[PDB]
């Protein structure tokens, strides 16, 4: 969950390599997209869309053993001064597009780093962010220019809890070398389905492993298998994806003067062409070239 | 006034230059694509200008490089313009040069009288690319720094002189201040003199032999 | 219409030039006022304006301070170095890579000495060359696009 | 980010013909 | 849309000025 990111990784969800900390637990990779505008004027509300698509009719393994749908979540890292728009500055069209989304900041004053926790993956395949651009005119460490936008999107359950123990949404290997004896399927009083294992063979060792049911089994009975043989299947149908984008915090005055200069250039070009034409007439008459 | 022109004419010999200039003609087969070399020159002139401009604020030091670039973007009047122009024109120069090469090649203009003009042009291309490689890492950001760090390794492969070449290009056993220093010298001192000499040749030959013939 | 001066084919000095591959500045439209003074500024200002326009609408990014202990994900040079970079990250033999790299300018230096076997300029009149050029061009663009993608899906572009 | 690439490709390819045509036009309207 | 209109319009206007300036200057017998 995006809030587990900020729990384990309080400073930033981005490591110095540009890898988003999310990937430390969401171990498979699916595609994530972003739509930002190429440029925005200062003090303007614009839309950033984060797309987390997955096959809607495929289902995942739930915490117990079930086969449930999946949730979407994303971190959006914006440039300095950028932040989620106040509700009274968002137009209506945009309001309807956003849905029931609880934008939180990653930490105090980290207003440009925006977490978006679990959302039902069937109405939020794409997440709409209403963002308000800052303004160089009345904030002296915000300057016009082009800045990065980092995006981290996930669908589906993770693989590691904050505590460091695996979830039921991954693979399970074999402990040591040797022939497996019994694959018993005992249980406690609280949690439901579990599965035991045993090994041995040759002078030494009688060890055992238990697998939280939910994935699947693909093992027969009794095989001289070494350390780390895939005895599971992979239940994971989700994944995490990163992107980078760029946004230009643009100044209207820059662009105004550009249009003006471009116009001057084109005029000057007409002038020169017409001047050539005058000379072409003079040369035809007075043969002296 | 008292005739200022006749003064200059008498010792500079303007008239001969004028006569020489207006004695040249452009044949019908010369189309718009014969502009590409001249456009390449324009891009470089834009590089010369804006590059010079930036040396008045850029500081080739690991402590100061990155933030001087920041200083240029945020604080210097029109800094952002100067730098963005230098950035884009760097790319346009390389693009136009490729387009120039296309035109030269698909026009047969590199043949018998003109192969030194082609050879000088290839050298110009290697020089230009070197400008690019060197300039790219001057901001000493994550991108530019990690672009040097990969290429600086490449020459090691060469059997006997490889480590020496590598050490020469990076100023020691690894990337650091010496690397930035050398790259800065390369980008702002060596490469502008080298490109000027080879462009000077390239153009002198062109002027000597005129354009190639119709296809 | 236009302005035109026809080749004076009676002047032995022009003839001697043409014979040698070079009398082509002697005839056509006048290089001076016509081209140099009137249209060159057009091309200069036009290219200058495109560049300035791109510079305003899409200014230079500054990255993040270099960090010697953290390698980015995605680590490309500039576009014109993509094809060379591609070659350089996909050949296992490092020496072989350096050589293939070196062979771009050295190969190109040899082009006029190889194609001096004839005096043709027109590409339609030299189908072997036009083919080889097109082949290299296409291989270049191929290796260029190849560099932007994962290695494992590059030597095929992820399409077969 | 490849719909934007192809957008720039298409335009820089296609705008030439618009410029060419518009140049041709001006030549007709002048009486070449 | 606005892009397309503005493009056509900007070029129309300047083709306008090109033509206008051609005949206009011919009229005053400058060209």
């Amino acid at each position: 969950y995006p809030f587990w990111a900020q729990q384990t990784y309080p400073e930033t969800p981005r490591e110095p390599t540009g890898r988003i900390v999310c990937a430390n637990c969401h171990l498979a990779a699916k595609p994530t997209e972003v739509e930002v505008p190429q440029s925005v004027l200062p003090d303007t509300v614009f839309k950033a869309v984060v797309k987390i698509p997955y096959d809607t009719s495929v289902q995942q393994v739930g915490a117990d053993g079930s086969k449930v749908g999946l949730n979407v979540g994303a971190v959006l890292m914006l440039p300095e001064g950028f932040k989620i728009a106040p509700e009274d500055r968002i137009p209506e069209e945009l309001k309807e597009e956003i849905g029931d989304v609880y934008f939180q900041p990653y930490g105090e004053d980290k207003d440009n780093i925006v977490i978006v926790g679990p959302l039902p993956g069937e109405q939020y395949q794409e997440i709409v962010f209403p963002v308000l651009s800052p303004n160089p005119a009345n904030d002296k460490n915000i300057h016009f220019g082009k800045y990065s936008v980092h995006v981290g999107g996930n669908r589906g359950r993770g693989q590691v809890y904050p505590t460091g123990e695996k979830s039921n949404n991954n693979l399970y290997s074999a402990a040591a070398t040797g022939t497996i004896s019994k694959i018993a399927k005992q249980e406690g009083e609280d949690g439901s389905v579990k599965y035991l294992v045993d090994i041995k063979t040759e002078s030494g060792e009688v060890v055992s492993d238990t697998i939280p049911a939910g994935p699947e089994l693909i093992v027969s009975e009794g095989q001289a298998v070494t350390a780390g043989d895939a005895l599971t299947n992979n239940p994971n149908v989700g994944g995490f994806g990163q992107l980078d984008a760029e946004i230009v915090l643009q100044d209207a005055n820059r662009v105004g003067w550009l249009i003006a200069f471009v116009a001057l250039v084109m005029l000057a070009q007409v002038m020169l062409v017409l001047k050539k034409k005058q000379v072409e007439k003079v040369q035809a008459a007075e043969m002296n070239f | 006034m008292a005739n200022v022109y006749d003064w200059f004419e008498e010792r500079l010999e303007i008239q001969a230059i004028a006569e020489d200039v207006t004695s040249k003609y452009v044949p019908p087969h010369v189309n718009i694509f014969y502009c590409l070399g001249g456009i390449t020159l324009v891009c470089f002139l834009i590089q010369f200008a804006t590059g010079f401009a930036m040396t008045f604020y850029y500081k080739p030091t690991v402590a100061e490089a990155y933030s001087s670039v920041q200083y240029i973007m945020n604080e210097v009047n029109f800094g952002w313009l100067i730098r963005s122009i230098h950035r884009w024109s760097a790319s346009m120069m390389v693009l136009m040069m490729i387009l120039h090469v296309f035109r030269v090649y698909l026009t047969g203009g590199f043949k018998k009288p003109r192969e030194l003009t082609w050879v000088s042009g290839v050298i110009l291309a290697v020089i230009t690319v070197s400008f690019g490689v060197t300039g790219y890492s001057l901001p000493w950001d994550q991108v530019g720094y990690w672009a040097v760090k990969i290429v600086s390794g490449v020459p090691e492969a060469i059997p006997v002189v490889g480590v020496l070449i590598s050490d020469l290009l990076r100023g020691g056993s690894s990337v650091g201040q010496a690397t930035l220093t050398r790259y800065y010298s390369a980008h702002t001192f060596v490469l502008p003199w080298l490109i000027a000499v080879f462009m000077l040749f390239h153009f002198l030959m062109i002027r000597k032999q005129g354009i190639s013939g119709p296809l | 219409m236009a302005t035109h001066k026809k080749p004076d084919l009676s002047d032995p000095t022009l003839r001697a030039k043409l014979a040698k591959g070079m009398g082509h500045n002697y005839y056509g439209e006048p290089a001076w006022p016509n081209d140099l003074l009137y249209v060159f500024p057009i091309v200069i200002m036009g290219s200058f304006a495109c560049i300035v326009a791109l510079a305003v609408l899409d200014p230079a990014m500054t990255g993040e301070p270099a960090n010697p202990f953290a390698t980015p994900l995605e680590i490309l040079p500039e576009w014109y170095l993509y094809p060379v970079f591609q070659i350089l990250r996909s050949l296992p033999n490092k020496l072989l890579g350096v050589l293939a790299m070196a062979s771009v300018p050295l190969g190109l230096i040899l082009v006029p000495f190889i194609e001096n076997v004839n005096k043709f300029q027109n590409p339609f009149r030299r189908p072997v060359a036009t083919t080889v050029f097109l082949f290299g061009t296409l291989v270049t663009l191929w290796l260029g696009i190849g560099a932007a993608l994962p290695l494992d899906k590059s030597l095929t572009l992820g399409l077969f | 980010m490849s719909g934007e690439l192809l957008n720039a490709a298409l335009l820089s390819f296609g705008l030439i013909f618009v410029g060419w045509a518009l140049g041709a036009l001006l030549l007709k309207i002048q009486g070449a | 849309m606005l892009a397309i209109v503005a493009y056509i319009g900007f070029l129309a206007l300047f083709t306008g000025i090109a033509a206008g300036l051609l005949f206009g200057l011919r009229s005053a017998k400058i060209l």
């Binding site: 440029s39 471009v262 050539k276 | 718009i32 | 326009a53 | 705008l15 518009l22 001006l26 | 070029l11």
Partner: peptide
Amino acid sequence: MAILTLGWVSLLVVFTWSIAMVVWGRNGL
């Protein structure tokens, strides 16, 4: 945000106009 669009438009206009002007001025190509 109209100005942002007119900005890009002007790039595309100079590019086109630059070609036009060359073609016109030097009679073709």
